[PDB]
Design a protein around this ligand. Structure first.
Ligand SMILES: [Cl-]
Ligand SMILES: [Cl-]
Ligand SMILES: [Cl-]
Ligand SMILES: [Cl-]
Ligand code: NA
Ligand code: NA
Ligand code: NA
Ligand code: NA
Lengths: 295, 295, 295, 295
């Protein structure tokens, strides 16, 4: 036997950081969950009990905190790039660092219509994420995403004209609920290293903003022919608005809301145009995915 | 042996309802999870295989949907009262109905700074809940709550002057993070039946609004001496603002954020006044509770 | 306003303990999650910022570990009694201690048909729990339970003869699947204090064993007329087998498995006697409860 | 823009099947969660609102149930192969089917030391899984796995000799707890189609058994130098015992159990050789991965 692939590190490292403006009194908080996995000339730790090649995961954890103390943790694309660069430069035998960051929301509270200088609310488990792969000799590959963005529209979703054969029982519809949990990823042009990442820092927050805005507006305004068609529209617009993105990926569940026929009870009409009460279905769910790139 | 208590019903009944204004085109959605448990002269179903006394849980489920179709589902206090009243009036041998409703957020989206007529976002897993106990001969007892309201303040929390003995290692502090998940319950005066509940309908939404507003403002503005002291302030104000409430209950975890001493690494200062990076702790957590009533 | 009730402490305290027999080499592990909430003359911590009455939750945590170091952690009924007794005896102003313990399974592995001296497997998330309320002047109240015991029988469950009216659509059946998650609680006679608890120590493990055995055998062997009827049989037998128990509580969801009519596809027969493939339903679910005591 | 990749289908399809031996009365149950995602000439559903190319996900769901009715659902490798083959053969324009199956445990109960003919227990959330990729022109690629296998050993784990630099604070140890959740995958030689899969059917259950046996025995018996070294040993042995496997993948978290220094309290000794009470840590955790193939 032989090692064909190996990576190891520390997962689920929770990190908080606060910024305090001494002058204004305004504090700003950041909270994330970090995973760092390293690759390199480490096979002998697996095959020969050779721990000398192991940068301890506990040290990896320490390094995350130390890096957060000495550097900005925002935008996460930059922080992840700094962190991954550290490992491959510090350790001659480590040749790749894989950094995943989940960013948790702490939105400043508005109290009596005024933003509060140090109090925050978790407005949703929606996450902003990055996957930053720092590979010696191959630059920095960044995938940015938003996830856990849960939405519903009560009309202006349709689904008709699909294939019908002996396995088909679904009725065509010209008016249904559409609800999903949005998982949207935008994949950046390869960066040659940390300098290039730094040169584009403002684009990270701006592109996340765009992705979220486009997602919401398209979902709300598209009289959807299918999840496929709507998600593609979202992806097209994001690519058109940021040339440094190469591809956009969407992964969308169709979280079904079923009509409930109540006509067995006193002739109650609750279907079609009379549909008011529905049964949200926990499972199963459609799952629709696509990766869109430039033509 | 003998049955000392018995209740049975349907749990986890997911319910959606839409309201459509034909004239404006504006649609409004509601989504909840309902549990209904009945009590009554049903012991023989347990002891003698006598299913004639069982209103099937599947029928209970149907009844929830039917009631939602024929009545407003908002405020949940009213809907729960209507539902529970139905069971004890419809079935001579059923003498209590216990209705729990979890209300899920569907906040109307703002697109290009305009509210969208039929698209919604789940802004947080914060829930609005009711527990409505309809008991024949004893009216309607309603407990209203908000839960899953997660907040953090980065300063203006303190904890000193607590008991110190041979089991104590916690250092006193004059400046710490405070983060919690708010579980707040307001218990209404008993109502004699559905008419009385109906007579107060506007107070349900208004009191939920007050409870949430007071919670957020007190959390943000109180330079907290302890979780105990802050939560009490919240409870006092809610009672002062709605005389139909008899008691206010808070259940608050203290979700710890630990300082990280980095001085072992290059003399880095990250404690006390220099504390910027912290380790959020998943467990354990303080848990602080109180029920406040009128003096 | 005034405090009507108050309790506070540390939740989610994870605890592991190992026993090592130096002579045999056999190691035995225990893992639990502990919650301790105290009550007493502590209202001024809520109303007057008086932290002198607060035994810090962090000290409560320390105390849990210290108690685990100096005492057996098994059976959990004893450990909880020792822990709660400590708080009310140590602190004059603390008059009640509420101890909840969740015990996690670490079953010794069998390797090559021989029990291994120090390796364990989590065979299920089934838990063994205790709720131990130590109240000054009122002894020790113990509720013991098993939870998360998930079972299924593929036949020998029936449900017919239930009430049928205009809200009923459920068909009667003489052969259905029954699956549940068992939550079973046995409530002990009040104990006057720690000595009395100690005098009965062997009965705690033996009664848990009995409760589990009776539950499984009755579930497997009862041709069930209803969940109500089956659970009552379980409760009767436990009470008959341990006189120090006063009541038995069961809380059982009916986790539905629906038939799937496939006759629309090539006349496939998959209902009634031909039913082979079913759709497990995540929600809703029946929920059936009862407390059984002595006649 | 253009579609670079696309796949869609039904996720979270829960499936139960029962086998009843009319002659013996012995019933056998199977429960799984199925996901099927299709690829093919479907881009126009995304780009041109062309739903004619969509095999509805609801039809995919129906097909899963129908296939389960007409075929064995065990071993899951075979069932997944049959299912995926169906889609690519039935639909000219569908060229790949990706089938994921999660198998849930229903272990026959032993009542009074005799196996019960129709009652089962979920002994753990350990899963047996398959990923079966049926690609037209490229056969059937199967990855089999076990997951959620949670284990602990209380000694005979070590970790010393790792790299030490200015980021290192972890002390070397010659005796620690090791606990993990095992995720083990064995990747089969490509099969040319369904016939070849069928020709090897007995090897699927036997190799799963081997993987599990080797995992448990190696974990229990290896005086572990590191997670890396132990997992490699597991992978080597599985490859040696089934030549139709090409690679073995392990993904193992190191779920830390920290010592607790209690010497501040009455000089209590609870570290090193005196360590009895530990604090299980929910996060962070080491994460160790490797893929092992043939030299
Ligand atoms: Cl779908
Ligand atoms: Cl606390
Ligand atoms: Cl039921
Ligand atoms: Cl580790
Ligand atoms: Na390097
Ligand atoms: Na009645
Ligand atoms: Na006392
Ligand atoms: Na095809």
């Amino acid at each position: 036997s032989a090692v064909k692939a190996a990576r190891y590190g520390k997962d689920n490292v929770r990190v908080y950081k606060v910024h305090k403006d001494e002058k204004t009194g305004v504090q700003t908080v950041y909270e994330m969950t970090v995973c760092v996995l390293l690759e390199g000339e480490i096979e002998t730790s697996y095959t020969k009990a050779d721990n000398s090649v192991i940068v301890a995961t506990d040290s990896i954890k320490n390094t995350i905190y130390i890096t957060a103390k000495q550097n900005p943790v925002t935008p996460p694309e930059l922080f992840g790039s700094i962190l991954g660069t550290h490992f491959i430069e510090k350790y001659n035998h480590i040749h790749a660092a894989h950094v995943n960051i989940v960013c948790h929301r702490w939105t400043r509270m508005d109290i009596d219509g005024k933003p509060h200088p140090h109090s925050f609310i978790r407005d949703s488990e929606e996450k902003r994420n990055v996957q930053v792969d720092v590979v010696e000799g191959k630059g920095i590959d960044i995938k940015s995403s938003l996830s856990g963005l849960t939405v519903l529209k009560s009309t202006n979703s349709q689904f008709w004209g699909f294939l019908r054969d002996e396995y088909t029982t679904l009725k065509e519809t010209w008016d249904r609920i559409l609800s999903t949990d949005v998982d949207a990823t935008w994949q950046w042009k390869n960066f040659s290293g940390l300098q290039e990442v730094r040169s584009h820092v403002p684009k990270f927050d701006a592109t996340w903003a765009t992705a979220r805005e486009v997602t919401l507006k398209t979902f709300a305004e598209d009289n959807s022919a299918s999840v496929q068609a709507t998600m593609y529209k979202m992806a097209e617009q994001i690519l058109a608005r940021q040339q440094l993105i190469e591809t956009v990926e969407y992964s969308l569940p169709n979280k079904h809301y079923f009509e409930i026929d109540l006509s067995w009870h006193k002739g109650l009409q609750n279907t079609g145009k009379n549909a008011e009460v529905f049964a949200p279905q926990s499972d199963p769910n459609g799952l629709i995915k696509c990766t869109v790139g430039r033509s």
